[PDB]
Design a protein around this nucleic acid. Structure first.
Length: 67
RNA sequence: UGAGCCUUGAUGUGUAGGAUAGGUGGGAGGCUUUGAAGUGUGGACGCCAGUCUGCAUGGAGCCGACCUUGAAAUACCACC
């Protein structure tokens, strides 16, 4: 559907993607969609590396990032 | 004995509140015989009210959005 969020003052944001029933392909497409979304807003004031760690977790799962 | 690093924990009050509300969103139920509340103790922290925990009984109960609260569960889960 639609999702919108505002990053934390500490430079980190958490986002709801959907129900974990979705498969890995859905997770990956949503991840890349939001990645491009935030890379559009990537401003000049943001120097150097931008995507540090997108720690995806769940109600009973650990938080891990991707490339 | 410093400087950090990774990991594990404890640490977080104007007060609108059942209250020592750190951003998060985890989504409405988790934790619990891998043992509950409720009781007799070691506590340090202590915004002297409250957090946590080993020991002994209990070992089946507390916490829900609950009732609010500008900011809600602090059921868990991770991140910071």
């Amino acid at each position: 559907g639609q999702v919108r969020y505002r990053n934390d003052k500490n430079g980190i944001i958490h986002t709801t993607i959907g129900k974990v029933d979705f498969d890995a392909d859905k997770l990956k497409e949503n991840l890349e969609a939001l990645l491009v979304a935030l890379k559009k807003a990537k401003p000049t004031q943001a120097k150097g590396v931008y995507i540090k760690k997108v720690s995806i977790s769940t109600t009973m799962g650990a938080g891990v990032a991707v490339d």
